[PDB]
Amino acid sequence: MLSPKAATLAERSAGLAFSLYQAMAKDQAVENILLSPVVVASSLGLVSLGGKATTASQAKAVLSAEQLRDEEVHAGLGELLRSLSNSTARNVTWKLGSRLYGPSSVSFAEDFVRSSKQHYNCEHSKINFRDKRSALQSINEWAAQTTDGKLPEVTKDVERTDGALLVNAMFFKPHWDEKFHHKMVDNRGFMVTRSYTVGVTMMHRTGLYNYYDDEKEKLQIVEMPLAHKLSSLIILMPHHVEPLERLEKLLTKEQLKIWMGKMQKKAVAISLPKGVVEVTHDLQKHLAGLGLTEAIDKNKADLSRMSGKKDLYLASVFHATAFEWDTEGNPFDQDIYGREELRSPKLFYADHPFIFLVRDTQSGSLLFIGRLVRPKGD
Amino acid sequence: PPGPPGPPGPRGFPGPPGP
Amino acid sequence: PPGPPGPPGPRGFPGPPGP
Amino acid sequence: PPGPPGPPGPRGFPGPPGPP
């Protein structure tokens, strides 16, 4: 169970992940979204750890952590990160690597490597960006190894090559509290728009799930408990096939609390696309739009705790995730339902774009947020 | 014994507007 | 074994009139 | 014990266009 310090940092991380999601959703080069709040927050913690003056103060400001001592930020986020990789009680597959790539000519300060390793498990390697073919190979191979092949290549190009690249590579596979049957899979169309359909594999289960149909805002919301019920995957989907902009305007922490309070445990037939969704985001511009203006600026950044010198700036914040929808989960008894309870289920038929998030059941704090707009398929 | 048949599928999406 | 699939859903509602 | 209920049938055909 998280300390009160870590719980406060989880809340800061959740508030930031929400603001970032909304910023990225307004960008029409952004299709699928996959974001881990503690990992986004750790990018800001690293900037605070490696920066001075306004470079670092902006990082804490974007995290709404102005009234936390610097050491409290790094400690609380570190406990969070270590908790997500604990695997003691969770039974949920989570692989995370964090690596700071610096130019070959820039020596990381011994104090910063120890601290970033201690708090953020951050790895460090100088790479020479003159040799681009090899630079991409270092990054992509490191990410593939971090995720055991689930994320085989994070990026095809590095645009700004004169600064630091922060790369986070992740694999996340929610493990259901009540598993889907491995044979309840078939092939159906996913409607990206009303004129473009992609053939997908869908997985299906009928069970008792917390559920709410908002007829007035034409959306459904369903709660899927993960293994041992210490977090839940929440799915939000409009009635019609439509851009998610309208739903995203409604989505807030407050509105979610209203929705969840209206939920009732009912028989629901859930149909979801099955498979791996891979997304790489460069958060650089979006963090800057949220207030991290100087760290990302070749001419302003003060990251001299990272390197001793002051020409280093944050060129990229790569946030790369493989999120796998699969049937596996905990087994469940004969029948905790009866012949009666599962008849005439509501359908939650996710054959068109939806928003999803993972919430901590205890503190209601966000633990993952994304949307599926265009699945992979042949 | 096999489980009972699944539910009917969802209604198709509404048609497009006219000319 | 899982039960068999349910029947297909009904046809969607007609679209709005053309402006 | 009997197996779980089967998956839903496929989504129905799309509706017709509206009048002009």
Numbering used by the authors:
A (entry chain A): 35 to 412
B (entry chain D), C (entry chain E): 1 to 19
D (entry chain C): 1 to 20
Copy text verbatim from the article accompanying this structure deposition.
In order to function, collagens require the specific chaperone HSP47 for proper folding and secretion. Proper triple-helix formation as well as exit from the ER of procollagen molecules depends critically on HSP47, an ER-resident chaperone belonging to the serpin family. The interaction involves Gly-Xxx-Arg triplets exclusively on triple-helical procollagen. The arginine residue is located in the so-called Y0 position and forms a crucial salt bridge with an aspartic acid of HSP47 (16).
The complexes of HSP47:CMP[RGF/RGL] crystallized in space groups P3221 and I222, respectively, which both are different from those of all previously determined HSP47 crystal structures. The structures were refined at resolutions of 1.94 Å and 2.5 Å with refinement statistics of R/Rfree 20.3/24.8% and 21.3/26.7%. To adapt the bulky hydrophobic side chains at the X+1 position, conformational rearrangements of HSP47 take place. For the phenylalanine-containing triple helix, Met225 switches to a different rotamer to form a small pocket shielding the phenylalanine from the solvent. In the RGF complex, the bound HSP47 at the A-site recognizes the arginine from the trailing chain and buries the phenylalanine from the middle strand. The results were similar to the prediction mentioned before (RGF/B and RGL/B), the phenylalanine and—less prominently—the leucine side chain clash with either the modeled second HSP47 molecule or the collagen backbone.
